[PDB]
Design a protein around this ligand. Structure first.
Ligand code: 5EF
Ligand code: 5EF
Ligand code: ZN
Ligand code: ZN
Lengths: 261, 260
């Protein structure tokens, strides 16, 4: 029953999940002293991201997150193995402090953050298996700032009032997930880190795009007010707010960039 | 035994020291959204800070930071109770990322940070006893940036090579500790928080001065490279670097400022 607030919050995770106190932890602050240009970081290609509108995909509130399941024919090409999609989810703040990205940039939080989780499907038959293995997971991260209304993100947000409580599931028609990515996807930060929730496995190759996307104040307010960590019938409801982890020590790591300036 | 790096680092402090996972944890980012002017916050008076140059004060490396012992006649006046000095110490990063303050300002780290710890001597006999009690401690924090050479900080830093390893100790002749405080000490942030090291008791009234001080690039590099966490005969030595805690969540709370 880990949480992001109170006795069971982040400084206590490592009591039950030892990797959360181990090395290579994410998220981190992306700042100049630890950035190094790497010309071998060539463009990723996003394959089968255009999910058919006539198909539908499962949206679930598991109490800690809201995730959309993605099909294994969706993949990223460019890495040293194929990585297939398994799910996407978000992280965000609260109505009175809409600053809940996980990674920060020169010490500043963005409003929210989208993660698209993939696993090495060349080597493993499912993401759970991959998650304990060296470079088993690759997660793409999109920074989200308060700005213009975003119709593509709204294809997800329009379904949240239907997965308002833990254990609830809804179906989302397919759309082109590439619409959720920012401009100039060839410009990104890359680093070795971990899951940012229990069990904090240090098995993730992170790609954080350099450019943020925008969603509106009203979309952030919906996202921040729609969802609960607890079941529909729980007599001690908890809102699902401020579901991001603080940034972590670097432990001598660098972050490699595909952009030189 | 706790450290700042590896399996014994900050995220595992709460196993042995449960307050590190509880309420009112420090340090925090001081940013505009959470700042509120409070006209009640008047200037502190630093009494007994001009330490006898005929007295010596113990500097020790405890494996976590370098600390100078301070005398109980040194005190802050201006708070509801008298708070008497017990020790000062510093936190810093490393020469590849030289930004190791504990508090940040609009998400930005300073080079380093000086803390002068005090305890409520009106209510408790010594800082150890106060440290887990209501209203027990008060810490002053000075932000440090690279700039001009600082003679006064050099009164401490010139002794660092004598306290290189864990368990080593040196003597520092009294000097005026107020020389380590910045300009316009009436300007400060105040908030209720905790120790930033085990046992992380939530018993600290924090005062962080608005203005930083300067030390030279050579002085900052000395601080970053002079000390180890380990004993002299340890086959696996460890540099004392990056001895600062990551900022904590601070939600539905204000930091009060003595300035607008
Ligand atoms: N920010 S993040 O990308 O690190 C990240 C999460 F933020 C997050 F919430 C979840 S979870 O499964 O919904 C919560 C745990 O129950 C996962 N899922 C993890 C749990 C273990 C596992 C195994 C295979 C694929 C994904 C995950 C996750 F990878
Ligand atoms: N950043 S800080 O101001 O919170 C702070 C420290 F950063 C730090 F390193 C120390 S310590 O004594 O050197 C190491 C054991 O905590 C202390 N000392 C505290 C620990 C408990 C205690 C008891 C009596 C006097 C001082 C302290 C500390 F208050
Ligand atoms: Zn995530
Ligand atoms: Zn300190």
């Amino acid at each position: 029953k880990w949480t992001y607030f109170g006795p069971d919050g982040e400084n206590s995770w490592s009591k039950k999940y030892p990797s959360c106190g181990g090395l290579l932890q994410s998220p981190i602050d992306l700042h100049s002293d630890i950035l190094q240009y790497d010309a071998s970081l060539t463009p990723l290609e996003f394959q089968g991201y255009n999910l058919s509108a006539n198909k539908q995909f499962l949206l679930t509130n598991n109490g800690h997150s809201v995730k959309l399941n993605l099909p294994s024919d969706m993949h990223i090409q460019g890495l040293q193995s194929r990585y297939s999609a398994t799910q996407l989810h978000l992280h965000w703040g609260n109505p009175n402090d809409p600053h809940g990205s996980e990674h920060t940039v020169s010490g500043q939080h963005f409003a929210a953050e989208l993660h698209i989780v993939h696993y090495n499907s060349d080597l493993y038959p499912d993401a759970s298996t991959a998650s304990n293995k060296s470079e088993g997971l690759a997660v793409l991260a999109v920074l989200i700032e308060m700005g213009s209304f975003n119709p593509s993100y709204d294809k997800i947000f329009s379904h949240l009032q239907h997965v308002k409580y833990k254990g609830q599931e809804a179906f989302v028609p397919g759309f082109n997930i590439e619409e959720l990515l920012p401009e100039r996807t060839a410009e990104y930060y890359r680093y070795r880190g971990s899951l940012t929730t229990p069990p904090c496995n240090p098995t993730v190759l992170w790609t954080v795009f350099r450019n943020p996307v925008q969603i509106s104040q009203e979309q952030l307010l919906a996202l921040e007010t729609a969802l609960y960590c607890t079941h529909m019938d729980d007599p001690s409801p908890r809102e699902m707010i401020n579901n991001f982890r603080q940034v972590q020590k670097f432990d001598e790591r660098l972050v490699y960039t595909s952009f030189s300036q």
